[PDB]
Ligand binder design. Structure first.
Ligand SMILES: OC[C@H]1O[C@H](Sc2ccc(Cl)c(Cl)c2)[C@H](O)[C@@H](n2cc(-c3cc(F)c(F)c(F)c3)nn2)[C@H]1O
Length: 138
């Protein structure tokens, strides 16, 4: 439906209580997906499901500053499945981004980029059919 890579502007950046919801379907034989919450050229929060990293499925999260990736945060719970519809919910909390997939909490990512109001774009890329991307204040 929506063209991927997709850019969702986040006017005035993010703030606690802002909820971003992404609906889509993983393509068959998917290799990767990425959500990039950007501050200009920096990536404040990169959320990156990898479907085949040495025959393992893993979600890699990181921050990119001045074109350098930092320390990766990895955990082993992988709720996505090739060919299946998903819902990602990213809730901005005062100290971290809180992520739920298909209504189940997945992970938290502590804020490395501190100027939340300058994280003004969300890029969505990878092996998905993107249905919708929106935000609301809870
Ligand atoms: O840490 C996270 C980064 O890890 C490597 S670079 C690297 C390698 C080793 C280490 Cl120890 C470190 Cl710290 C960094 C990736 O190449 C990088 N990356 C992924 C994508 C990308 C682009 C897409 F278009 C897309 F659809 C997609 F799903 C993904 N672009 N850039 C990013 O995931």
């Amino acid at each position: 439906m929506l063209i991927v890579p997709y850019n969702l502007p986040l006017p005035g950046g993010v703030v606690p209580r802002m909820l971003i919801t992404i609906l889509g379907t993983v393509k068959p034989n998917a290799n990767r997906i990425a959500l990039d919450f950007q501050r200009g050229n920096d990536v404040a929060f990169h959320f990156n499901p990898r479907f085949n990293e040495n025959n393992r499925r893993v979600i890699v999260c990181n921050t990119k500053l001045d074109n350098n990736w930092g320390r990766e945060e990895r955990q082993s719970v992988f709720p996505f499945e090739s060919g299946k519809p998903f819902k990602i919910q990213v809730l901005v909390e005062p100290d971290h981004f809180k992520v739920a997939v298909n209504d189940a909490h997945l992970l938290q990512y502590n804020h490395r980029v501190k100027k939340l109001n300058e994280i003004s774009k969300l890029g969505i890329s990878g092996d998905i059919d993107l249905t919708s991307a929106s935000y609301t204040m809870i």
